[PDB]
Amino acid sequence: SNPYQRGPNPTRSALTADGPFSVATYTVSRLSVSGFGGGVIYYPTGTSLTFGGIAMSPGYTADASSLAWLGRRLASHGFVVLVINTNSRFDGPDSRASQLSAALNYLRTSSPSAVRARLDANRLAVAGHAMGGGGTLRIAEQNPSLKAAVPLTPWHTDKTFNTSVPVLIVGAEADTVAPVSQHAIPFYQNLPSTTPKVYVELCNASHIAPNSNNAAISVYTISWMKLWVDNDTRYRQFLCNVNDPALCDFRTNNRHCQ
Ligand SMILES: O=C(O)c1ccc(C(=O)OCCCCOC(=O)c2ccc(C(=O)O)cc2)cc1
Numbered sequence: 001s002n003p004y005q006r007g008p009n010p011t012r013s014a015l016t017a018d019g020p021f022s023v024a025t026y027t028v029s030r031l032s033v034s035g036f037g038g039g040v041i042y043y044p045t046g047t048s049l050t051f052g053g054i055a056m057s058p059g060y061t062a063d064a065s066s067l068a069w070l071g072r073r074l075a076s077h078g079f080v081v082l083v084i085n086t087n088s089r090f091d092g093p094d095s096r097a098s099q100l101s102a103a104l105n106y107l108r109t110s111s112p113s114a115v116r117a118r119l120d121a122n123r124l125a126v127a128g129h130a131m132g133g134g135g136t137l138r139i140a141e142q143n144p145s146l147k148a149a150v151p152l153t154p155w156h157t158d159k160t161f162n163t164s165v166p167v168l169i170v171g172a173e174a175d176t177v178a179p180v181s182q183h184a185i186p187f188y189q190n191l192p193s194t195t196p197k198v199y200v201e202l203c204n205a206s207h208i209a210p211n212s213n214n215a216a217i218s219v220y221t222i223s224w225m226k227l228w229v230d231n232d233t234r235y236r237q238f239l240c241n242v243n244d245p246a247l248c249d250f251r252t253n254n255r256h257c258q
């Protein structure tokens with residue numbers, strides 16, 4: 001019934017490991033593109049199907065390798081994922097939004113034949129770590145066609161974003177770089193009350209929790225992307241009536257459960 005539905009019915013344990021699809025990679029060289037610093041595309045292979053696309057930005061000082069595990073994880077559950085490198089490692093959050101915009105335009109219009117064949121360019125979303133998560137919030141305000149935004153331990157001087165793009169924010173309890181009380185939580189609270197939004201806080205987690213295999217980040221990022229990029233309501237079960245002992249905070253307006 002849902003033409004975008006991919007993969008077997010999910011279970012929580014299946015969302016903590018790589019998923020049903022084999023993954024190929026394509027390296028986007030810095031010299032080959034303008035507007036961002038290249039990156040790595042993770043995309044499903046061994047299939048004739050098409051999938052939604054995700055542009056993902058790393059944080060301050062970081063490069064695409066800091067989110068390689070998550071690019072591969074998401075792609076293996078049925079997505080085309082472009083993890084960008086930035087023009088400069090010291091670009092700020094709004095600059096990272098601009099480079100996510102360029103990466104999405106690249107995916108739509110100039111990506112390789114092998115990627116385009118697996119991509120439904122009508123269904124795009126964004127995610128990002130730290131300053132990259134700040135960029136995710138900015139681009140969500142500018143591009144209302146985006147299906148979802150997932151800021152991970154986000155950082156931004158702007159605390160106020162107006163978007164109707166559904167947002168799930170992951171905060172890290174022990175984050176000293178982007179403290180949840182000054183970044184993640186104000187981001188969540190100042191989003192419109194009419195926008196479907198979720199905030200989860202990982203117990204004991206550090207600012208660098210997004211940079212390596214993390215079960216909770218896997219579960220919530222996959223499920224939010226599935227729900228909104230694919231209209232796949234089978235993933236509501238992991239986002240609704242949540243009782244997760246990995247979390248030390250959870251806030252929502254519960255607009256995503258029906
Ligand atoms: O993402 C992370 O993992 C992360 C985030 C923050 C820090 C941090 O210690 O922040 C204070 C020092 C840097 C401030 O950087 C800017 O304010 C800025 C503003 C605009 C631009 C621009 O491109 O115009 C560039 C840079 C460390 C790591």
Ligand SMILES: [Ca+2]
Pocket residue numbers: 158159160161
């Ligand atoms: Ca603002």
